Amino acid sequence: MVVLHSLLGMAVLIAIAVLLSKAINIRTVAGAFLIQVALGALVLYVPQGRDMLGEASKTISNVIAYGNNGVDFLFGGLVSEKMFEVFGGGGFVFALRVLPMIVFFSSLMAVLYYIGVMQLLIKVIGGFLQKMLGTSKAESMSAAALIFVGQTEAPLVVRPYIRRMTESELFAVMSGGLASVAGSVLAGYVQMGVPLPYLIAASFMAAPGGLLFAKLLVPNEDEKPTNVIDAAASGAVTGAQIAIAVGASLLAFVALIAMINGIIGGVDLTLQAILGWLFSPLAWVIGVPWSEAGIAGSLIGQKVVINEFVAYSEFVKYLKPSDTTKAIISFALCGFANLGSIAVLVGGLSIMAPKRRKDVARLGIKAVVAGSLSNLMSAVIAGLFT
Amino acid sequence: MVVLHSLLGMAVLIAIAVLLSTDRKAINIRTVAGAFLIQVALGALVLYVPQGRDMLGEASKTISNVIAYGNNGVDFLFGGLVSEKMFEVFGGGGFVFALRVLPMIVFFSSLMAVLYYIGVMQLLIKVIGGFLQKMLGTSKAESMSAAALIFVGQTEAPLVVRPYIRRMTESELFAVMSGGLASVAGSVLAGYVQMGVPLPYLIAASFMAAPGGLLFAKLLVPETERTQNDAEVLAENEDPTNVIDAAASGAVTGAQIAIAVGASLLAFVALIAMINGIIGGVGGWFGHGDLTLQAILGWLFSPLAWVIGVPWSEAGIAGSLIGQKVVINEFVAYSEFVKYLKPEAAVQLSDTTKAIISFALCGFANLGSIAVLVGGLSIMAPKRRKDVARLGIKAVVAGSLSNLMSAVIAGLFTG
Amino acid sequence: RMVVLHSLLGMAVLIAIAVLLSTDRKAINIRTVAGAFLIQVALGALVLYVPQGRDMLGEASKTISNVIAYGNNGVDFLFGGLVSEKMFEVFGGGGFVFALRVLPMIVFFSSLMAVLYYIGVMQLLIKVIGGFLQKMLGTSKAESMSAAALIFVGQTEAPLVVRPYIRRMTESELFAVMSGGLASVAGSVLAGYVQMGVPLPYLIAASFMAAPGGLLFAKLLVPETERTQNKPTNVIDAAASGAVTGAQIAIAVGASLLAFVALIAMINGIIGGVGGWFGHGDLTLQAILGWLFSPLAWVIGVPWSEAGIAGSLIGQKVVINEFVAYSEFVKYLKPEAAVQLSDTTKAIISFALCGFANLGSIAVLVGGLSIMAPKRRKDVARLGIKAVVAGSLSNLMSAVIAGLFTGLSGA
């Protein structure tokens, strides 16, 4: 029963990467992967690993509780338990919980960035990744942000250094951004599914894993605030208008998916089944049983287009009245990687520097294939330390 | 029996245009009489001869499904806030206009944006444009601008005319303005459906506005200059990578529209309610405290409402709605029209009166629509911006009559 | 009686602090600061002391409120029954959704104040009040119109009435525009304050005092004294335009408060934690700023059993923003209030908090004013700190004049 399937999966995923690729730095990819599996192995298993995991996340669980009280003020009782007594799970509103947090996380990080807390963490961790793997400063810094900040909140930092940056790290930022899980996606889980430490685990894995699959084939006046209030205010506004963009995209995509599902019925096999039939070997290789590869394959297919939420909902529907396939599908669900986030990031980076946005559209979905395979690698890794 | 009263209407409507036209002698007849025939032909087509309503029913159920595919996205972003329970809890007010309409603007906007890059739009406009140019003698520029505005969402709307706008004649410049006001974007169209407006009438009101748009456009200011050849023009590349950026760019822009519409509604609805608090007050001493802006417009537009074919017994209402359409905007008219439509039936209206108004209210032709046109064309053709603003009122009248002509034909037929 | 010496003490302090922080305590003109103060206290007794005025102010609450009622008709149509009575029975106290019941009035008033601009109703009133101060206070016409302009008017129209006089203005004229802008408030925010549950009539008098009080401490710091010397298509487009701009503000305001509220809750989680090692695990920023502004809370004439509370609210405004202070002030006006404050206290606080004078306003003024006059962008950041004080003194001055003329309770 000792897993060879795990190492088999890692062998295949890295092989496909080479097949899809070549002359890459081996000291970069072997080290990045080493860091990925080691960090994940230690924080999950060996002592002081999970003990720390609970302390630096229960603090975050309080940060989320602060955001709740912030929403409680603005939206009143709609975010109370009165909805659940009438509509129940239908009383759960997506736009009142998933979107408004973007505002807070944007403003809060704008404060941390103004002080130097974010720069500190990014400069230290960034210097670590560029020393152990011999990578450029830009990508190593951007990855560090994606651990703490979301995906759309990362280019806000690595903007000026991202000007003349090569396409090598460009794919790295976008692949890391999609694989990233903090702020707006960490959001969802804690307030609906409530896995407290899954927030930290998937986040810390996202950046180095992202810098791994991406590095497979890697190698005029403005104004700024004076005080902290300006930063907290400006960040909120930026996070607000971004939230309007996010929520609009999500409604549209889910709606178009309902359309592509309707056109297939016309032309009784749903698209969710087609995705579950096609991407079934990917689950078989990852370690998921063949008996549950048809269902989890759909969620993977839903992970391709739809956000991780609808796939998570259908997952919990299977949970409500195996442990290996559950966690394997859980960490696979963790990550903001989807066809939606690509478009949002492309629009965000287009606002940063459209002069390079022309050739910065060639990668596109390749970043999703990188961020997903990176996070899926992190999921298969979690199956090794169950 | 008596279809003459409608033909009387058609005569007056077309007459008024000539009375206001710049030069009657310069009016081409093979152009206007043709488009007029196409409009009424399409009328008897989609209504009288059975097969027209069937193909209409196809698009009805189709769009209805497309709309239903949208709701699954809405019910996700806002949860089940709008359900059968919601109607039970909050009663009649349970129908949240903000959350049951504006999301469709985001959806259809993201739909048309996708169907545009694929070429599905570029193809349809090309065929229909090549038709109206071969029939009415008009050039390619207008015919594409007349065929497009039936289907296509706003703000990717100009790109068809974009290279032509900066150097076209007054009529061609006026024909686009008359079309833009006579037309109705698919985004707001879906909004009407959610309000309870009959979809089959919205679709039928659309395909009529294109020939009806060119009708009063060419009838007011005729073409006298040259139909510029294609080889003589020199365009500029736009600078929409793929389907990913298509649905996104179309959704986010549809959101900025949905938010913009909402504030405009909340404004006008509240401001009109304030004017009625002033009119009612001033008019109260004279013995009519119940007097309002709706009643005055109804009392004012009472005659015109009768000419199109509506009975006088229902003119006191018809004038208000059409009155509100022109002086306020398009939404406010329908919002105070669905009240007469639902089974509450404070006053029941005939199928003909309910239909003629469904077509009469279809159009952006309102005094508050000029700033959108001029504000949009100025960004493209800043040299003509002075000419576009001069033909402001003239265009609102044209687009209005175009919606009236489309209505008379609807009320005319009884099948 | 027998406040009156204690209030006059408070006023004299506010004037004293102005003379100290002034760049030149000798260039101050008597006819200006004495006149601007005289008008301020005069308008105070006018709407508070004489019964004939409380009738005017009472009339200037029914009218304004009736405008708010017309707005709610637009909100009820937009959201349906979400804000109706049914929501109260289900969610109780939480039924009052601050997002759907208050912000929509930021949208409506932003349109109305844009409809009255295309008509010329505003150009009429501004020209009147502006001309009056131009003759009496002797100020150059620019800041007089501006000072008169701000009271009613929403932002991004308000810069469009001073635009021609920005660059050509002096150090004083510039300081008077930014001082008044911080002294008074707009209609976009005033409308929300009523929906919040704040006494309207106090906000009216407060707004009318911010103009003379603004130019009082503005000119009480600057000399000037080197010789200053000298689009919508229709109504429908005017309304729709004002609605969209109001809508982009509402999203900005509501989103800023969500952040600001959640952050304060986070600060108390840290300071509460720090205090945990000190011994006081329940340490919050309210009491800290309470104790900090507690001395100042006594200068204006607040009881010692309430000066500790007012200081926490006055402090909350300055270091963050007024809109947050009003959110924790209405909890003391409820009929089930654990503590119902003194009838004189409830008035003074209202006049104190009414104003855009805080840190978050600086960054907005420096930026927006640089968009029009980019050359002076360096001078605004220099006077950005002094203007907030000059703007605060205006509101704190009106708070004393208010508390002084408290002869009757409201609501």
**What DSSP assignment string belongs to B139-184?**
-HHHHHHHHHHHHPPTTSSGGGTHHHHTT--HHHHHHHHHHHHH--
DSSP C154: P
Give the torsion sign (CA, C324, C361, C349, C306). positive
> Is residue A191 within 8 Å of residue A161, measured between CB atoms?
no
* Shortest distance, CA C229 to any CA of chain A (angstroms): 32
Inter-axis angle of helices A339-352 and A167-179, to 10 degrees?
130
> Is residue B100 within 8 Å of residue B87, measured between CB atoms?
no
Find tokens 């009016």 and name the residue. Answer: B27
Residue C156: CB atoms within 10 A of its CB come to 16
> Is residue B144 within 8 Å of residue B110, measured between CB atoms?
no
* Shortest distance, CA C187 to any CA of chain A (angstroms): 21
Indicate the length of chain B as a whole number.
415
Name residue A294's amino acid: G
Residue A322: CB atoms within 10 A of its CB come to 10
Q: Is C234 on the interface with B (CB under 8 A)?
A: yes
Q: Is C262 on the interface with A (CB under 8 A)?
A: yes
Give chains near C: 3+ CB pairs under 8 A: A, B
Give which of B399, B23, B28, B29 is closest to B217, Cα–Cα.
B399
Chain A stretch 101-130, residues whose beta carbon is closer than 8 A to a beta carbon of chain C? 103-104, 106-108, 111
Beta carbons of B273 and C87 less than 8 Å apart: no
Give which of B185, B145, B184, B136 is closest to B164, Cα–Cα.
B145
Tally of helices (H runs) and strands (E runs) in chain B? 21, 0
> DSSP assignment of C66-134, as one string?
HHHHHHHHHHHHHHTTTTSHHHHHHHGGGGS-HHHHTTHHHHHHHHHHHHHHHHTHHHHHHHHHHHHHH
* Shortest distance, CA A204 to any CA of chain C (angstroms): 24
> Is residue A210 within 8 Å of residue A35, measured between CB atoms?
no
Distance from the Cα of residue C400 to its chain's centroid: 15
Give which of B108, B243, B245, B117 is closest to A347, Cα–Cα.
B245
> DSSP assignment of A303-370, as one string?
HHSS-HHHHHHHHHHHH---HHHHHHHHHHH-S--SHHHHHHHHHHHHHH-TTSTTGGGSSTHHHHHH
Residue of A nearest to B241 (CA): A361
Q: Is A192 on the interface with C (CB under 8 A)?
A: no
Beta carbons of A82 and C94 less than 8 Å apart: yes
Beta carbons of B252 and A245 less than 8 Å apart: yes
Give which of C402, C396, C364, C348 is closest to C217, Cα–Cα.
C396
Q: Is A34 on the interface with C (CB under 8 A)?
A: no
> Is residue C356 within 8 Å of residue C184, measured between CB atoms?
yes
Residues of C in contact with B277 (CB under 8 A): 66, 70
Distance CA B185, CA B206 (A): 9
> Is residue A385 within 8 Å of residue A195, measured between CB atoms?
no
Distance CA B403, CA B20 (A): 17
Distance from the Cα of residue A42 to its chain's centroid: 21
> Is residue B190 within 8 Å of residue B67, measured between CB atoms?
yes
Which of C73, C87, C251 is closest, CB to CB, to B273? C73
Indicate the length of chain A as a whole number.
386
Give chains near A: 3+ CB pairs under 8 A: B, C
Q: Which long-range contacts (CB under 8 A, 24 or more apart) does B132-135 make?
A: B132/B35, B132/B38, B132/B210, B132/B211, B132/B214, B135/B34, B135/B35, B135/B38
Give chains near B: 3+ CB pairs under 8 A: A, C
Distance CA C206, CA C200 (A): 10
Residues of A in contact with C384 (CB under 8 A): 226
Q: How would you class C111 by CB atoms within 10 Å of its CB: exposed for 0-12, middle for 13-18, buried for 19 or more?
A: buried
* Shortest distance, CA B99 to any CA of chain C (angstroms): 7
Half-sphere exposure of B382 (CA within 13 A, CB side): 1
Q: Which pair of tokens denotes residue C366?
A: 């420096």
Distance CA C154, CA C36 (A): 24
* Shortest distance, CA B72 to any CA of chain A (angstroms): 6
Give which of B365, B334, B22 is closest to B179, Cα–Cα.
B365
Which of A100, A107, A229 is closest, CB to CB, to C359? A229
- Specify whether the backbone of C147 is left (phi greater than 0), alpha (psi in -120 to 50) or beta: alpha
Q: What are phi and psi of C329, to 5 degrees?
A: -100, -35
Q: For residue B274, give every residue at least 6 positions away whose Cβ sits within 8 Å of its Cβ, in sequence order, or none.
A: C67, C70, C112
Indicate the length of chain C as a whole number.
411
Experimental technique of record:
X-ray
Q: Which pair of tokens denotes residue B146?
A: 């007349």
> Is residue A211 within 8 Å of residue A142, measured between CB atoms?
no
Q: Is C254 on the interface with A (CB under 8 A)?
A: yes
Q: Which pair of tokens denotes residue B221?
A: 């200011």
Q: For residue B137, give every residue at least 6 positions away whose Cβ sits within 8 Å of its Cβ, in sequence order, or none.
A: B28, B30, B31
Q: Which pair of tokens denotes residue C132?
A: 């009056």
Name residue B202's amino acid: L
Residues of C in contact with B262 (CB under 8 A): 78, 247
Q: Which pair of tokens denotes residue C21?
A: 């922080």
Q: Is A183 on the interface with C (CB under 8 A)?
A: no
> Is residue C175 within 8 Å of residue C148, measured between CB atoms?
no
- Integer CA distances (angstroms), C55 to A223, C49, C180, C409, in order: 48, 11, 27, 14
Distance CA C343, CA C350 (A): 12
DSSP C161: G
> DSSP assignment of A244-296, as one string?
HHHHHHHHHHHHHHHHHHHHHHH----HHHHHHHHTSHHHHHHT--GGGHHHH
- Specify whether the backbone of C2 is left (phi greater than 0), alpha (psi in -120 to 50) or beta: left
Q: Is A351 on the interface with B (CB under 8 A)?
A: no
Q: Is B370 on the interface with C (CB under 8 A)?
A: yes
Q: How would you class A221 by CB atoms within 10 Å of its CB: exposed for 0-12, middle for 13-18, buried for 19 or more?
A: exposed
Beta carbons of C258 and A86 less than 8 Å apart: no
Beta carbons of B77 and A262 less than 8 Å apart: no
Q: Which pair of tokens denotes residue C393?
A: 């003194």
Beta carbons of C95 and A77 less than 8 Å apart: yes
Residues of C in contact with A227 (CB under 8 A): 359, 362-363
Residues of B in contact with C63 (CB under 8 A): none
* Shortest distance, CA C88 to any CA of chain B (angstroms): 11
* Shortest distance, CA A47 to any CA of chain B (angstroms): 41
Residues of C in contact with B91 (CB under 8 A): 81, 86
Resolution of this deposited model, Å = 4.1
- Specify whether the backbone of A192 is left (phi greater than 0), alpha (psi in -120 to 50) or beta: alpha
Residues of B in contact with A344 (CB under 8 A): 248
> Which secondary-structure segment (H or E) carries A120?
helix A117-132
Q: How would you class C29 by CB atoms within 10 Å of its CB: exposed for 0-12, middle for 13-18, buried for 19 or more?
A: middle
* Shortest distance, CA B23 to any CA of chain A (angstroms): 49
* Shortest distance, CA A114 to any CA of chain C (angstroms): 14
Which of C78, C232, C241 is closest, CB to CB, to B266? C78
Q: Is C358 on the interface with A (CB under 8 A)?
A: yes
Residues of C in contact with B96 (CB under 8 A): 79-82
Q: What would the 3-class secondary structure string for B302-339 be?
A: HHHHHHCCCCHHHHHHHHHHHHHHHHCCHHHHHHCCCC
Q: Which pair of tokens denotes residue A304?
A: 């391709």
Half-sphere exposure of A19 (CA within 13 A, CB side): 6
Beta carbons of C255 and A232 less than 8 Å apart: no
Output the CA angle A197-A202-A204, nearest 5 degrees. Answer: 100
Distance CA B309, CA A351 (A): 54
Alpha-carbon dihedral of residues A73, C256, B104, A365, nearest 10 degrees?
-120
Give which of A116, A117, A166 is closest to A138, Cα–Cα.
A166
> DSSP assignment of C326-368, as one string?
TTTTGGGTSTT-SS---TTHHHHHHHHH-S--SHHHHHHHHHH
* Shortest distance, CA B383 to any CA of chain C (angstroms): 17
Chain B stretch 42-101, residues whose beta carbon is closer than 8 A to a beta carbon of chain A? 65-66, 68-74, 76-81, 83, 85-86, 89
Q: Is B251 on the interface with A (CB under 8 A)?
A: yes
Q: How would you class C45 by CB atoms within 10 Å of its CB: exposed for 0-12, middle for 13-18, buried for 19 or more?
A: middle
